Amino acid sequence: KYPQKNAELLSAQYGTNLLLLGVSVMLALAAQSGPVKEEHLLSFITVLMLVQLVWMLCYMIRRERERSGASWIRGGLTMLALLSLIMDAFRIGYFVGYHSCISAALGVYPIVHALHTISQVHFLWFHIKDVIKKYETFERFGVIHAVFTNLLLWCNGVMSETEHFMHTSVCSMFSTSLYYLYPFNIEYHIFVSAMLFVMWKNIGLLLGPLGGLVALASSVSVLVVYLIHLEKTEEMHEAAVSMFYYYGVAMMACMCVGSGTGLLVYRMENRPMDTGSNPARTLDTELLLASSLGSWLMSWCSVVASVAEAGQKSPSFSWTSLTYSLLLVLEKCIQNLFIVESLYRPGRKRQILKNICMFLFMCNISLWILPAFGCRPQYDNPLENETFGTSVWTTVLNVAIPLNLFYRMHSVASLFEVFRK
Amino acid sequence: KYPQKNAELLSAQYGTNLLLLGVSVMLALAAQSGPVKEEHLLSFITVLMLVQLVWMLCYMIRRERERSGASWIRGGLTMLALLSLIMDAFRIGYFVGYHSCISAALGVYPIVHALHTISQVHFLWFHIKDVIKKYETFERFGVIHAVFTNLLLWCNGVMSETEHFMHTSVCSMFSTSLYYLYPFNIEYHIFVSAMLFVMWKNIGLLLGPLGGLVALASSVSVLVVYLIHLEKTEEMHEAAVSMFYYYGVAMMACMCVGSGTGLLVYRMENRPMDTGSNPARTLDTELLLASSLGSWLMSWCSVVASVAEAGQKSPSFSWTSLTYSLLLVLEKCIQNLFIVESLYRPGRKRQILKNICMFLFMCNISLWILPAFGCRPQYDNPLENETFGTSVWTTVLNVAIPLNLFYRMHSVASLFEVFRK
Ligand SMILES: CC(C)CCC[C@@H](C)[C@H]1CC[C@H]2[C@@H]3CC=C4C[C@@H](OC(=O)CCC(=O)O)CC[C@]4(C)[C@H]3CC[C@]12C
Ligand SMILES: CC(C)CCC[C@@H](C)[C@H]1CC[C@H]2[C@@H]3CC=C4C[C@@H](OC(=O)CCC(=O)O)CC[C@]4(C)[C@H]3CC[C@]12C
Ligand SMILES: CC(C)CCC[C@@H](C)[C@H]1CC[C@H]2[C@@H]3CC=C4C[C@@H](OC(=O)CCC(=O)O)CC[C@]4(C)[C@H]3CC[C@]12C
Ligand SMILES: CC(C)CCC[C@@H](C)[C@H]1CC[C@H]2[C@@H]3CC=C4C[C@@H](OC(=O)CCC(=O)O)CC[C@]4(C)[C@H]3CC[C@]12C
Ligand SMILES: CC(C)CCC[C@@H](C)[C@H]1CC[C@H]2[C@@H]3CC=C4C[C@@H](OC(=O)CCC(=O)O)CC[C@]4(C)[C@H]3CC[C@]12C
Ligand SMILES: CC(C)CCC[C@@H](C)[C@H]1CC[C@H]2[C@@H]3CC=C4C[C@@H](OC(=O)CCC(=O)O)CC[C@]4(C)[C@H]3CC[C@]12C
Ligand SMILES: CC(C)CCC[C@@H](C)[C@H]1CC[C@H]2[C@@H]3CC=C4C[C@@H](O)CC[C@]4(C)[C@H]3CC[C@]12C
Ligand SMILES: CC(C)CCC[C@@H](C)[C@H]1CC[C@H]2[C@@H]3CC=C4C[C@@H](O)CC[C@]4(C)[C@H]3CC[C@]12C
């Protein structure tokens, strides 16, 4: 009835205009000397979530007229969805337990979002995982609408929520719970938009595990001492922060050595390389680069701030921030190159590669659990504050840290898939 | 010696980090309460231009050890390069004719840029146009460095130049010449980055021409009356601005009717559509969408401002801004769909299609010459100012209008290629 290239071009233009309309509303909102208020942005996003709910309802009632590494993706989606639903339950509980002096749009939004989350998970659980069976104008509209709805939810969570949060026991528990649960909501929308992008575009092992266990035990130790000296008063806090930075430096140096050793083992073994012209390589490559973007931006902001301070011959320079930031950039570059080469290719080289893969696997688990459980000292750095401002540095960190969490989860799954080869 | 997929991944990571370092410097610059000043950004971009000059020198001296619709692209590149070189000559002339109270980085930058421009044009003239003969790590590094150098030059021109310009006859001629020549410099860097993206990714005709001539004569008339009532004092200026808006509305309505008529002629003639799976279709499609982004953002900002003003039941609403902006969005959507379908497919349908193609060809020439020759009243709109602020609206227009010029040039060449079929 209707051609497919025109369907995909119309859907691309529709979704692009949807994104640019949301960006226009956010630009009108940020210039506070104007009539556009935050409830208007929440009403716009609420209407988008309702349209996606209606589409998913029509899709499931159409499919129920017919009858007949996925587990890593489903587990990640379900865990992040449960944390997002817990945060929405806290928001609804606050809305039914407070002095009713805020607008109705802040009550309808956490309810619809919750329904949106549930339905979206159900859809992404059941009607997508190798059960597609057709691609027409209806599914292309739905997938593109879902992509840009989740991107606008990501932008709203990144900017217009923690510039209100990061700027009576029930209020303390509410604020503490929001502080711990926020990056999992942001990463949830990152994860959902990444999956929808994928489906849119397509349609003797001793020393390794032992070093990994040392990495894990050391991360839990640093996490525990930081949370202890964060929960109580400010004494011995800066020792915990310096412990975080020295641990990060040593660990990323060891990960650079491991990934480089893997790359040199690959270089010494010559192969008829790179003849297949694999588009799946391009897909996983763009996922790893898009995940690496946030932490690369954070690290170059720290490098620029430290070099600008060093240009004054100032005190409190200390060389550890430069080493940490540059080693973080270098570590993600070498690890991305190692994973991408590993996924698309005697016995002693198998034992070396498996020990390297288990070491990097447990190191990425460690570097995931350290900010996810609430360490994150970078928000209180006095150097990048007063250079970029508190609002710009906070927004840069809100972009960087959930993308860093998604990067570590994707790298854990990818290194596990590399390991069983 | 070295595999190609690792070369392209390393080059992608290098260029991405180069862009993010430039973005970090710009973020440190925009927060003016800090040590980073504009001469540091100019020094950084100057170093990038010098590195590209050194690479192009080594490439040409390596090639000179060996011996043996392109004209539209070469003509566009050479015209925009000549206008950019004229602007750089004006900057150098000011730097040798003034009170020497600004830093040396503002003298070295317009010289090196001029050399950069000349060398880049020479390279893009001679060593690229079907003479590639090899792709290795050296060329991938050079092409990626050239891409992100031109993107950083585009961002510097968009933001850090007209927030200093748009905020004694020689000073008047200097400022007037900069006002007229600025969008051609921005479009020049857009054009060069688009060409380098392309080469990176790949490696009875009566009523039509008559309506086109009416469109051209009417555009020159509107342009002349606007420039007359802009050069002298403010009387009869708002009549010229309203004439611009009524001309735009009527013309984009006629272009919507023409493009829709072309699409319906395509729909009535059934074909075995869309089997070839053409990646060149994807390439031209991404060029047209990327060009359409700027004007779509500008139009949705105008729609949001007018709807926010209408929500007060205010005076000075007048319905022409909404009609102009929505019709602009709709016109670019239908025209993109028409061009993309036309490029990748009895006699009366040939005459209808050729008349539509000549009409759209001359209409796109008209809508190119109207802002390129200096009309651009959108900067003085009181509605989008005081809603977004003067700086945000000016930056949005500096993104939108050179992209709109590149869009109209690309559409002129594409409609000419469609016409001779
Ligand atoms: C290309 C795909 C993968 C992602 C698309 C990226 C956008 C979703 C992001 C990147 C640029 C971001 C914008 C970058 C800057 C700003 C300006 C910001 O307001 C300002 O700082 C203006 C200055 C002021 O008055 O405060 C409002 C949000 C916004 C539009 C951001 C909205 C979200 C955007 C569009
Ligand atoms: C109208 C003009 C202003 C728009 C054209 C600019 C962008 C559409 C292009 C220019 C070069 C492109 C970049 C060129 C290189 C790449 C690397 C690319 O990664 C890969 O090539 C994967 C490598 C592999 O498949 O193995 C990711 C996209 C990116 C950053 C591109 C992002 C989009 C860019 C900036
Ligand atoms: C693959 C390559 C070619 C594309 C790289 C994407 C970047 C160009 C995007 C991704 C993340 C974006 C950043 C997301 C967040 C921010 C913070 C944002 O800060 C604010 O909006 C100011 C906040 C305030 O004023 O309160 C400014 C834009 C910026 C740096 C964005 C700049 C554009 C970035 C780096
Ligand atoms: C993906 C390819 C095709 C293009 C990459 C797009 C970037 C080149 C653009 C889009 C987002 C832009 C950023 C959007 C917002 C800002 C914030 C702006 O400063 C602010 O407004 C912060 C608030 C303030 O303190 O004023 C500085 C420039 C910057 C980083 C822009 C720099 C240029 C960026 C990175
Ligand atoms: C880690 C996560 C947060 C990053 C993943 C987000 C982006 C990389 C993706 C998500 C969906 C993508 C969009 C999906 C649809 C398209 C349409 C696409 O145009 C076409 O499909 C051409 C159609 C044709 O070939 O005929 C241009 C890129 C774009 C906007 C994509 C831009 C990049 C997006 C935003
Ligand atoms: C294909 C699709 C998926 C990608 C669409 C790209 C957009 C997400 C990019 C392209 C142009 C970018 C805009 C370029 C210019 C600006 C103005 C800029 O304004 C400022 O920096 C504030 C100026 C000041 O404060 O003085 C804010 C970011 C913004 C809206 C950028 C938002 C991000 C945009 C819309
Ligand atoms: C393809 C990719 C993105 C899939 C995502 C990988 C997911 C499934 C993996 C990677 C990181 C893993 C987490 C690492 C740490 C812990 C902490 C532990 O106390 C509970 C399990 C939990 C929370 C793991 C759950 C599974 C997990 C989230
Ligand atoms: C592939 C695409 C981008 C090629 C670009 C098309 C270029 C070559 C075309 C499209 C618009 C054309 C311009 C339209 C208007 C005029 C004004 C006239 O007084 C001088 C010629 C000039 C300046 C034309 C020169 C050629 C031109 C710039």
Tab-separated table of C-alpha atoms in Angstrom, chain B residues 131-361:
chain	number	residue	atom	x	y	z
B	131	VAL	CA	41.815	10.534	-6.982
B	132	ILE	CA	42.074	8.629	-3.685
B	133	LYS	CA	44.076	5.504	-4.696
B	134	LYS	CA	44.747	4.370	-1.087
B	135	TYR	CA	43.166	4.499	2.358
B	136	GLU	CA	45.443	3.923	5.353
B	137	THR	CA	46.012	5.237	8.866
B	138	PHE	CA	47.567	8.459	7.523
B	139	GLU	CA	44.590	9.507	5.397
B	140	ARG	CA	42.063	8.463	8.063
B	141	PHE	CA	43.860	10.589	10.668
B	142	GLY	CA	43.994	13.513	8.244
B	143	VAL	CA	40.341	13.328	7.203
B	144	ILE	CA	39.089	12.974	10.797
B	145	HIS	CA	41.333	15.821	11.977
B	146	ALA	CA	40.023	17.983	9.136
B	147	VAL	CA	36.401	17.122	10.016
B	148	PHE	CA	36.655	18.047	13.661
B	149	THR	CA	38.859	21.075	12.974
B	150	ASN	CA	36.133	22.403	10.688
B	151	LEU	CA	33.434	21.564	13.247
B	152	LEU	CA	35.305	23.481	15.944
B	153	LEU	CA	35.753	26.390	13.527
B	154	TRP	CA	32.001	26.273	12.861
B	155	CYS	CA	31.178	26.346	16.587
B	156	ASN	CA	33.660	29.163	17.226
B	157	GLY	CA	32.166	31.195	14.391
B	158	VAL	CA	28.582	30.538	15.497
B	159	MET	CA	28.989	31.320	19.183
B	160	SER	CA	32.207	33.113	20.075
B	161	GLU	CA	32.167	35.610	17.191
B	162	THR	CA	28.661	37.092	16.957
B	163	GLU	CA	28.233	37.227	20.692
B	164	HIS	CA	31.033	39.774	20.277
B	165	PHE	CA	29.670	41.288	17.034
B	166	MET	CA	25.864	41.108	17.406
B	167	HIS	CA	26.339	41.286	21.226
B	168	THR	CA	35.457	56.754	11.326
B	169	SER	CA	34.257	55.559	7.921
B	170	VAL	CA	36.737	52.653	7.936
B	171	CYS	CA	35.123	51.155	11.048
B	172	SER	CA	31.682	51.488	9.451
B	173	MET	CA	32.814	49.749	6.254
B	174	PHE	CA	34.569	47.060	8.321
B	175	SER	CA	31.490	46.320	10.456
B	176	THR	CA	29.110	46.429	7.463
B	177	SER	CA	31.355	44.088	5.457
B	178	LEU	CA	31.528	41.661	8.386
B	179	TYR	CA	27.724	41.782	8.723
B	180	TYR	CA	27.266	40.844	5.084
B	181	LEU	CA	30.070	38.269	4.842
B	182	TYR	CA	29.613	36.313	8.122
B	183	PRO	CA	27.046	33.598	7.104
B	184	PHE	CA	29.134	32.656	4.086
B	185	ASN	CA	32.087	31.901	6.372
B	186	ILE	CA	29.843	29.773	8.600
B	187	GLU	CA	28.335	28.008	5.588
B	188	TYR	CA	31.858	27.463	4.225
B	189	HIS	CA	32.809	25.469	7.297
B	190	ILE	CA	29.461	23.620	7.110
B	191	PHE	CA	30.148	22.793	3.450
B	192	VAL	CA	33.703	21.576	4.058
B	193	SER	CA	32.638	19.399	7.000
B	194	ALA	CA	29.815	17.937	4.879
B	195	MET	CA	32.187	17.048	2.015
B	196	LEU	CA	34.697	15.512	4.407
B	197	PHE	CA	31.864	13.545	6.030
B	198	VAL	CA	30.885	12.222	2.591
B	199	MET	CA	34.420	11.125	1.737
B	200	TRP	CA	34.899	9.687	5.243
B	201	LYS	CA	31.714	7.643	5.049
B	202	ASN	CA	32.161	6.341	1.500
B	203	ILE	CA	35.868	5.554	1.841
B	204	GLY	CA	6.309	22.409	-23.549
B	205	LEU	CA	7.951	23.766	-20.394
B	206	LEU	CA	5.954	26.969	-20.114
B	207	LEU	CA	4.172	27.546	-16.794
B	208	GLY	CA	6.942	26.145	-14.585
B	209	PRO	CA	9.711	28.524	-15.706
B	210	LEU	CA	7.205	31.409	-15.835
B	211	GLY	CA	6.096	30.865	-12.233
B	212	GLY	CA	9.756	30.531	-11.315
B	213	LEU	CA	10.550	33.856	-12.982
B	214	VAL	CA	7.677	35.484	-11.081
B	215	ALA	CA	9.145	34.013	-7.876
B	216	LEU	CA	12.611	35.380	-8.734
B	217	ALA	CA	11.397	38.860	-9.741
B	218	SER	CA	9.271	39.096	-6.592
B	219	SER	CA	12.231	38.049	-4.417
B	220	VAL	CA	14.512	40.671	-5.979
B	221	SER	CA	11.757	43.266	-5.468
B	222	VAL	CA	11.339	42.369	-1.767
B	223	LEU	CA	15.133	42.338	-1.327
B	224	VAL	CA	15.551	45.761	-2.949
B	225	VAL	CA	12.779	47.449	-0.939
B	226	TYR	CA	14.105	45.896	2.291
B	227	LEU	CA	17.698	47.008	1.648
B	228	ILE	CA	16.503	50.509	0.730
B	229	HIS	CA	14.395	50.859	3.877
B	230	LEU	CA	17.155	49.251	5.983
B	231	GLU	CA	20.014	51.453	4.741
B	232	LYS	CA	18.139	54.685	5.500
B	233	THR	CA	16.062	55.601	8.576
B	234	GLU	CA	13.310	53.555	10.183
B	235	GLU	CA	10.248	54.886	8.303
B	236	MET	CA	8.447	52.293	6.111
B	237	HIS	CA	10.609	49.481	7.528
B	238	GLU	CA	7.805	47.416	9.074
B	239	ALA	CA	5.951	47.414	5.751
B	240	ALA	CA	9.046	45.800	4.212
B	241	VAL	CA	9.203	43.244	7.039
B	242	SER	CA	5.512	42.369	6.632
B	243	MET	CA	6.111	42.145	2.866
B	244	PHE	CA	8.878	39.622	3.587
B	245	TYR	CA	6.533	37.532	5.731
B	246	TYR	CA	3.585	37.583	3.285
B	247	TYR	CA	5.932	36.727	0.411
B	248	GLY	CA	7.366	33.840	2.433
B	249	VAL	CA	3.908	32.499	3.327
B	250	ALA	CA	2.562	32.627	-0.245
B	251	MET	CA	5.735	31.168	-1.726
B	252	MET	CA	5.988	28.266	0.706
B	253	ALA	CA	2.308	27.481	0.162
B	254	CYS	CA	2.965	27.291	-3.589
B	255	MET	CA	6.028	25.105	-2.998
B	256	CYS	CA	3.960	22.784	-0.779
B	257	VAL	CA	1.362	22.483	-3.550
B	258	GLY	CA	4.043	21.742	-6.165
B	259	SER	CA	5.893	19.158	-4.074
B	260	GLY	CA	2.624	17.494	-3.058
B	261	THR	CA	1.566	17.327	-6.708
B	262	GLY	CA	4.870	15.633	-7.537
B	263	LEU	CA	4.336	13.120	-4.734
B	264	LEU	CA	0.799	12.318	-5.920
B	265	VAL	CA	2.043	11.798	-9.490
B	266	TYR	CA	4.563	9.369	-7.989
B	267	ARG	CA	1.858	7.594	-5.961
B	268	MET	CA	-0.536	7.101	-8.880
B	269	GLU	CA	2.222	5.504	-10.975
B	270	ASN	CA	2.847	2.215	-9.155
B	271	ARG	CA	6.366	0.774	-9.204
B	272	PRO	CA	8.163	-2.202	-7.625
B	273	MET	CA	9.468	0.220	-5.031
B	274	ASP	CA	12.440	0.140	-2.675
B	275	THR	CA	14.165	-3.169	-3.382
B	276	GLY	CA	17.733	-1.998	-4.072
B	277	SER	CA	18.567	-1.030	-0.433
B	278	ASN	CA	20.693	1.922	-1.564
B	279	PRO	CA	23.211	3.351	0.948
B	280	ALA	CA	23.668	6.451	-1.245
B	281	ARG	CA	19.997	7.145	-0.514
B	282	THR	CA	20.902	7.062	3.176
B	283	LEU	CA	23.814	9.459	2.537
B	284	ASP	CA	21.761	12.096	0.686
B	285	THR	CA	18.922	11.583	3.177
B	286	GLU	CA	21.182	12.358	6.146
B	287	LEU	CA	22.533	15.427	4.331
B	288	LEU	CA	19.006	16.761	3.733
B	289	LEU	CA	17.867	16.029	7.302
B	290	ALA	CA	20.987	17.594	8.832
B	291	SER	CA	20.443	20.690	6.700
B	292	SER	CA	16.745	20.840	7.645
B	293	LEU	CA	17.540	20.709	11.400
B	294	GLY	CA	18.420	24.401	11.758
B	295	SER	CA	15.297	25.820	10.196
B	296	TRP	CA	13.129	23.264	12.002
B	297	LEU	CA	14.620	24.416	15.320
B	298	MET	CA	14.047	28.073	14.389
B	299	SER	CA	10.440	27.407	13.360
B	300	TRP	CA	9.576	25.448	16.494
B	301	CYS	CA	11.086	28.210	18.637
B	302	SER	CA	8.817	30.695	16.852
B	303	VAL	CA	5.794	28.394	17.297
B	304	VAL	CA	6.491	27.991	21.029
B	305	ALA	CA	6.892	31.761	21.482
B	306	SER	CA	3.689	32.587	19.578
B	307	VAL	CA	1.629	29.926	21.393
B	308	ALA	CA	2.990	31.120	24.754
B	309	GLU	CA	1.954	34.667	23.837
B	310	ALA	CA	-1.474	33.469	22.630
B	311	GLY	CA	-2.000	31.782	26.003
B	312	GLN	CA	-2.258	35.272	27.548
B	313	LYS	CA	-4.960	36.374	25.020
B	314	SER	CA	-2.532	39.188	24.219
B	315	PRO	CA	-2.566	41.696	21.370
B	316	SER	CA	-0.023	41.565	18.510
B	317	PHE	CA	-0.632	37.871	17.767
B	318	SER	CA	-1.639	38.322	14.094
B	319	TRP	CA	-1.532	34.642	12.912
B	320	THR	CA	1.161	35.245	10.271
B	321	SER	CA	4.102	34.029	12.360
B	322	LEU	CA	2.358	30.716	13.103
B	323	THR	CA	1.385	30.249	9.458
B	324	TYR	CA	4.909	31.115	8.292
B	325	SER	CA	6.643	28.824	10.800
B	326	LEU	CA	4.329	25.811	10.447
B	327	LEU	CA	4.307	26.149	6.671
B	328	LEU	CA	8.119	26.304	6.710
B	329	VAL	CA	8.288	23.020	8.671
B	330	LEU	CA	5.732	21.386	6.367
B	331	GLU	CA	7.443	22.693	3.217
B	332	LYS	CA	10.845	21.297	4.150
B	333	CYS	CA	9.302	17.936	5.094
B	334	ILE	CA	7.402	17.551	1.811
B	335	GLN	CA	10.322	18.834	-0.284
B	336	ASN	CA	12.786	16.424	1.359
B	337	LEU	CA	10.396	13.539	0.737
B	338	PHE	CA	9.938	14.601	-2.904
B	339	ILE	CA	13.673	14.973	-3.616
B	340	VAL	CA	14.629	11.687	-1.931
B	341	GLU	CA	11.912	9.763	-3.785
B	342	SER	CA	12.765	11.502	-7.082
B	343	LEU	CA	16.465	10.666	-6.953
B	344	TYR	CA	15.947	6.923	-6.399
B	345	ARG	CA	13.289	5.579	-8.757
B	346	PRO	CA	3.279	8.844	-20.032
B	347	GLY	CA	4.759	11.942	-21.698
B	348	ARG	CA	2.265	14.199	-19.911
B	349	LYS	CA	3.663	13.003	-16.587
B	350	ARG	CA	7.134	13.951	-17.857
B	351	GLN	CA	5.886	17.450	-18.677
B	352	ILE	CA	4.176	17.768	-15.280
B	353	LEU	CA	7.277	16.552	-13.430
B	354	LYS	CA	9.646	18.787	-15.409
B	355	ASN	CA	7.458	21.848	-14.823
B	356	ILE	CA	7.323	21.044	-11.092
B	357	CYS	CA	11.104	20.560	-11.005
B	358	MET	CA	11.816	23.880	-12.736
B	359	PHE	CA	9.339	25.672	-10.462
B	360	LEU	CA	10.922	24.237	-7.306
B	361	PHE	CA	14.415	24.885	-8.721
